[PDB]
Amino acid sequence: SMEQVAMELRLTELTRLLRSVLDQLQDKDPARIFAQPVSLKEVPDYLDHIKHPMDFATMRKRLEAQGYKNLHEFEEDFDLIIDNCMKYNARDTVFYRAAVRLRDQGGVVLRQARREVDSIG
Ligand code: NA
């Protein structure tokens, strides 16, 4: 149907926006702390601590299968990245502080993004 197709052109254009957002977000991680999932070989207790791990590559796989239906959903995933790190790591570590920085820098990118998704529909 033509109704289905138009919904599909909207998903596709959300997807194109979200990809840009994810490149922007991930430029605020020059160190690449958050680029890949935590290794269960190198932090074998990780899953006793963190119930829903997240990382930028896992968001990117989801994005390329157009698995994000709106910006809230993508935002939820970004926030897990931050919130998981801030839980597992102590306030005086380079990891915790790299998440605070990514949160504050990420907040701006997502602030305008939210206006573009409401504006362009
Ligand atoms: Na903690």
From Swiss-Prot:
Compartment(s) of residence: Nucleus; Chromosome
Superkingdom of this protein's organism: Eukaryota
Bromo domain: residues covered: 9-113
Covalent cross-link Glycyl lysine isopeptide (Lys-Gly) (interchain with G-Cter in SUMO2), where: K41
Residues spanning the membrane: none
Tissue note: Highly expressed in testis.
Coiled-coil intervals: none
Assembly mode: Component of some HBO1 complex composed of KAT7/HBO1, MEAF6, ING4 and BRD1/BRPF2. Component of the MOZ/MORF complex composed at least of ING5, KAT6A, KAT6B, MEAF6 and one of BRPF1, BRD1/BRPF2 and BRPF3. Interacts (via PHD-type zinc finger domain) with unmodified histone H3. Interacts (via PWWP domain) with dimethylated and trimethylated 'Lys-79' on histone H3.
Function: Scaffold subunit of various histone acetyltransferase (HAT) complexes, such as the MOZ/MORF and HBO1 complexes, that acts as a regulator of hematopoiesis. Plays a key role in HBO1 complex by directing KAT7/HBO1 specificity towards histone H3 'Lys-14' acetylation (H3K14ac), thereby promoting erythroid differentiation.
Protein name: Bromodomain-containing protein 1
Species of origin: Homo sapiens (Human)
